[PDB]
Ligand binder design. Structure first.
Ligand code: PYC
Ligand code: PYC
Ligand code: NA
Ligand code: NA
Lengths: 310, 310
């Protein structure tokens, strides 16, 4: 039995499996270079960690890495049931809260290396975490999409640390009891995007889809389809970052102004942005809670030792 | 803060969360009496253990209990995302394999108390487990059912440790890549059963639905919808038990004869039955593997400490 030592947490219901020991050595390169090696040479390990039976389709994993920079407290690579993420907001909140749980950091400011750049997390007195994310921006606005059976929708294409399509005119009901219909709708959206050749910058695959609606207890409520067709239980840190860039460009949110984003299950992030140069810097605040301390055990006689399915 | 100590395993891909410490005390009564107490007074604990975010909709839990009988090695209560099970074949295989992992038993024959009676498990040299289940029987045969959009189907109503509706003339393709349509189909079947007021013996709610099909490498492949609308990744021990009773009554399987049942994801059980009196005793053999050793942590500040959702 190979062993993988993890701290499982969740942020607003969205889980993070922080791998603290047991994965193959990925060398001493950047987090982006280590991601390439992990995917190319050791992708079976991602599958063991986060697919059924030892994980779940909902699960996002985070491999804790020694960072290159002396002033960074950690590096991380994020992954899910289908592949690799860029940044991960809920995941970074989970990582920091987990490092605190392990006694490796205290309250204060920490820099975390990721495959898309270094972010800065503040662990507050209440143990919530603010993440100063990589820069966010809108690439295209009100891109028209024909949805069979639904008709035309318009969406923004925006980068928040992953690529998102953001839709307000969907006409769908956003609530936990409707996640089946919402999942089908957003799958159809991604299909339509793929059909029409619509990408982000430099042919970036738009693999996250988010729908927005009014909420009586927040500025907005969202539903977010992740690359592997599981939904985000949280308001989605990178997704909300993309949203801030869109609001700003539309003249609807100024620097420093708070924006409360509720998730499909009612959890909340508060967010604002700062302007540095031409760049918009999204800052997200939320809380994670520890779910479990676990050691995954990989039995060589188990036919699903490297995970179930395709 | 509060801790729940578990051994997670899976049987042919179907997970079992064996709770070995941390649940409230349920007294010294029978397993059935303890189930009553667990559900009435402590159902939040089931939810904390097996619902999101610390569990999954797929997960079946098994609370380890001290048995009443001096010659029993353990008692168990089984539960899922919706409520409580009776017996659980895959879960018993997982329990026995987990007790061996913990060094609490060795290879040989063990009696396990359950809410529907005592079963006998044999842990073999290859670490597979044979479970001699409680008696099984067919209650009604070829019950007619109109399915709006399909229509009509015929099924058997049978007890294998839980109540099942068993269908062969469904016209559905049974494979992992089709679980979405299979889930809808069985949901409708159950919908139709409730509509017509169809039950098992003494008003027994038929809460498991199973479809059967031919298989090139087994006698049959099945899809099993569990009470909480998750599917069984295993061939389903109690489900296959019910199947043996139906086959026997139809003159299609004699005592001692092997029946190989494949699951929707390709895992297999081998099964046969023995005849004692007017009773049919189903015997199921399969293998579990350990997934993880974990300590669930229940943070009082966590909004979802007792689980997400309805
Ligand atoms: O919080 C996020 O940034 C995220 C991306 C995918 C899932 N969660
Ligand atoms: O294996 C079984 O008996 C079972 C029942 C529900 C899920 N698995
Ligand atoms: Na509002
Ligand atoms: Na066959």
């Amino acid at each position: 039995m190979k062993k993988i030592t993890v701290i499982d947490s969740h942020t607003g219901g969205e889980p993070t499996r922080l791998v603290i020991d047991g994965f193959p050595d990925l060398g001493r390169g950047s987090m982006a270079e280590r991601l390439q090696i992990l995917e190319r040479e050791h992708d079976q390990w991602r599958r063991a960690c986060v697919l059924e039976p030892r994980g779940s389709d909902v699960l996002v994993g985070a491999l804790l890495c020694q960072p290159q920079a002396g002033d960074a407290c950690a590096g991380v690579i994020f992954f899910n049931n289908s592949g690799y993420l860029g940044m991960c907001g809920h995941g970074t909140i989970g990582l920091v809260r987990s490092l605190y749980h392990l006694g490796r950091i205290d309250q204060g400011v920490h820099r975390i290396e990721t495959p898309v750049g270094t972010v800065e997390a503040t662990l507050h007195e209440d143990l919530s975490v603010s993440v100063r994310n990589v820069p966010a921006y809108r690439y295209r606005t009100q891109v028209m999409l024909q949805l069979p059976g639904h008709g035309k929708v318009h969406g923004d294409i925006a980068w928040g640390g992953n690529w998102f399509f953001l839709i307000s005119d969907h006409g769908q009901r956003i609530a936990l009891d409707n996640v089946e219909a919402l999942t089908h709708y957003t799958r159809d959206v991604r299909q339509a995007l793929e059909a029409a050749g619509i990408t982000g910058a430099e042919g970036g695959v738009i693999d996250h889809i988010e729908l927005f609606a009014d909420d009586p207890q927040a500025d907005s409520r969202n539903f977010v389809l992740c690359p592997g067709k599981a939904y985000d239980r949280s308001p989605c840190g990178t997704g909300t970052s993309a949203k801030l860039a869109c609001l700003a460009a539309d003249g609807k949110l100024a620097p420093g102004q708070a924006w409360r984003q509720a998730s499909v299950i009612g959890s909340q992030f508060s967010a604002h942005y700062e302007k540095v140069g031409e760049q918009l810097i999204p800052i997200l605040r939320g809380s994670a809670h520890i779910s479990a301390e676990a050691t995954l055990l990989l039995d060589d006689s188990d036919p699903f030792v490297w995970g179930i399915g395709s």
